[PDB]
Write a protein that binds this ligand. Sequence first.
Ligand code: NI
Length: 341
Amino acid sequence: TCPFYKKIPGTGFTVDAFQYGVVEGCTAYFLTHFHSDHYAGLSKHFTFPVYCSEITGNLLKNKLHVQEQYIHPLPLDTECIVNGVKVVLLDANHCPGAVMILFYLPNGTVILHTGDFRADPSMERSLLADQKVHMLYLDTTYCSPEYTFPSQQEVIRFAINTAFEAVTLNPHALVVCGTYSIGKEKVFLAIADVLGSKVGMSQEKYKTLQCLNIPEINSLITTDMCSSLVHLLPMMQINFKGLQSHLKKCGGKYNQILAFRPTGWTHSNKFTRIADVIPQTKGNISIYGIPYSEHSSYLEMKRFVQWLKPQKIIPTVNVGTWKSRSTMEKYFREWKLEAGY
Ligand code: NI
């Protein structure tokens, strides 16, 4: 049945709650972003109002064929009224089109649902600064102090410099980047830009990228693989077998692959600095695991919450085990006692 942490009290609203059939008494279904664990259940047969960003609405229409009449896109940073309740969508710093939702309940309670987010100090100067939040529905993906990672900027610097060096040494090397969803577009786009190439990809993936309002996208991507030296493939194919196979298909145009796997976290982060990352190599194939995250680190998450000072926190991730739930609640109490709220 629909879990409580997907329901917004004092409203008929749900968030990311499309796989439970008709939720009893739900008058509006919000969708924070276009990732499959969140949209699971939407299709052309869905006939209730869906509220979301413009970008998420482009993907619902074009990829899942949801009918236009049930898609209600809202502008960001704008007070809007939905079934008589004031709401604001804020940028979540996750994947394209991802939002956080502020609900202003008729009784005076203010609720923030972060969706999936990567907390950033820039959030401390949005419309969140203007009033108090009483309840926070928090993306707790990496809510443990072992989860450190570098900035997105530092990781893209590493990737650009690595790719540029490799291809300048060997003009017959191919760069490959893995993907399984929207998000992390900067990895492949920044590499193509330094190399003076477009990124080549499947028709399905080109379609998905054309829904994202990215500036000058027609200039950066293509379905012509032949004219491209940066290729995008499914994440599953980023292994020695899948890469050897792909290299066969390029018909002796290339004699080396440098591949990137943008993971979330991997335990090499406890020890390894970004400067110190090395690939796994077999023959003329090298694979780099790079820690490009679109979720908060532990310290980023802690800073955001100690700034916001919510009265109650409801985790939305890692809620299925007692040991995880109990450990998170202990961090929340620490943060509150350290900060004095
Ligand atoms: Ni997500």
